[PDB]
Nucleic acid binder design. Structure first.
Ligand SMILES: [Ca+2]
Ligand SMILES: [Mg+2]
Ligand SMILES: [Mg+2]
Length: 430
DNA sequence: ATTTTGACGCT
DNA sequence: AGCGTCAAA
């Protein structure tokens, strides 16, 4: 009752660029705008592997992970943009730089946590308090929320999408108590106003469109973000949680899309997030561990406390290349040449990072996969990273992995290598 | 033969 | 330290 926390203490947004790599290429090449198009890596094997897909192409059934040749079977007029190749490998520099454009715009509004190349969490609690102070009890106009959906509305006693959006928004604003500066629903509504402003700023200053979720924590903000894409934002209030979760597959909640979610479904014999409410905290801890159990018990009630971390920059800088099937590296020379290619890209990115961000990586992580291993990585070794020098880094990586070569022949490498990975970690201020 | 990434938990 | 999990374009 009066002491039961409700996880309504924060306003958190998650902003996620729509079909990000596609928008980067469409900004660059106007011929691709408003077309079924996709971004692809490589080209020789089955036309290349698709990594990003415009919504026009998605209407034909084109998806990520599809080979371009097969996507062309579904969408004959599909246009393609190729990822840059440098030093024999795909190079994602263009997308990292576009990401920096968006992250720097978002950081003007609030502290952000970079969650991936194209998405960031925003802690809007403080910004909401100031905006509420400026508003001075003034009602919030639907005009301030031109692209916002209120999850769960309209409800109760138009057949077009925008009509429904406005109906729900009208119901929500009609119900709001604007005189209580401490109302969680009001705080979320002001948050959504700020996110409308953030998203307009991103589109104005970059050309890129995005979607966003606004809620009281990161998990609900992420889930909300996905409910109305593209180019829209969704507010998930605390009160919307019971109905939303009553038919929400467990796997749709962030961190439950893999084995743990599968085990929750299998062990408990449930399908939807809301069904978790029927278990005690101790029961959930008994099956999934103390930490997971406490997290699940609160999350199924819409409560999560993971903070928006103040971190705009990635914590590691890595380069990697797979060598599938017959291309697996089977000679020492091959392994050293590709280690050099990776190390040269890594050096270029590390030097840029050091100049821009006043930091230096101090550890080099070397990871390989050997042909015949189910795991993504077969082996991981670290060494000191003391100089931004590609030849030294590639030599050091070879030194830490050379004993993995079973082969009795000095010139040959066995078992052949199907993956190489170099990652600079453990940054210190400089 | 999705590939190339990036964060964080466990022991 | 090294491995595993979950997630992104
Ligand atoms: Ca996205
Ligand atoms: Mg996606
Ligand atoms: Mg994303």
């Amino acid at each position: 009752g009066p002491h039961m926390a409700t996880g309504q203490d924060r306003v958190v947004a998650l902003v996620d660029m729509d079909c990000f790599f596609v928008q980067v290429e469409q900004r660059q090449n106007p011929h691709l705008r408003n077309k079924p198009c996709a971004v692809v890596q490589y080209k020789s094997w089955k036309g290349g592997g698709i990594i990003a897909v415009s919504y026009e192409a998605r209407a034909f059934g084109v998806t990520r992970s599809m080979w371009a040749d097969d996507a062309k079977k579904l969408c004959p007029d599909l246009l393609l943009a190729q990822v840059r190749e440098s030093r024999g490998k795909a190079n994602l520099t263009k997308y990292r730089e576009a990401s920096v454009e968006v992250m720097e715009i978002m950081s003007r509004f609030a502290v952000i946590e970079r969650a991936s190349i194209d998405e960031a969490y925003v802690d809007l609690t403080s910004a909401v308090q100031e905006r509420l102070q400026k508003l001075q009890g003034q009602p919030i106009s639907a005009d301030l929320l031109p692209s916002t959906y209120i999850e769960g509305l309209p409800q109760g006693p138009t057949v077009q999408k925008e009509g429904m959006r406005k109906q729900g928004l009208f119901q929500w604003l009609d119900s709001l108590q604007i005189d209580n500066l401490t109302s969680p629903d009001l705080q979320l509504t002001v948050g959504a106003v700020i996110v409308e402003e953030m998203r307009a700023a991103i589109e104005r200053e970059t050309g890129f469109q995005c979607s966003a979720g606004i809620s009281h924590n990161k998990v609900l903000a992420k889930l909300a973000c996905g409910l109305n894409k593209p180019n829209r934002q969704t507010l998930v209030s605390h009160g919307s949680v019971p109905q939303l979760f009553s038919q929400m597959p467990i796997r749709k909640i962030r961190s439950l899309g893999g084995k743990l979610g599968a085990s929750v479904i299998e062990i408990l014999g449930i399908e939807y997030m809301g069904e978790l409410t029927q278990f005690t905290e101790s029961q959930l801890q008994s099956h999934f561990g103390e930490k997971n159990g406490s997290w699940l018990y609160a999350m199924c009630r819409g409560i999560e406390h993971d903070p928006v971390k103040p971190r705009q920059l990635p914590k590691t800088i890595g380069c990697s290349k797979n060598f599938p099937g017959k291309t697996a590296l089977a000679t020492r020379e091959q392994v050293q040449w590709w280690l050099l290619q990776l190390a040269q890209e890594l050096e270029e990115r590390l030097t840029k990072d050091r100049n821009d961000n006043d930091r230096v990586a101090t550890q080099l992580v070397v990871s390989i996969r050997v042909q015949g291993d189910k795991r993504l990585s077969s082996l991981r070794r670290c060494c000191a990273l003391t100089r931004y020098d590609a030849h030294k880094m590639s030599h050091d990586a070879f030194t830490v992995i050379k004993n993995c070569n079973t082969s009795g022949i000095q010139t040959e490498w066995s078992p052949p290598l199907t993956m190489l990975f170099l990652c600079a970690t453990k940054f210190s201020a400089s």
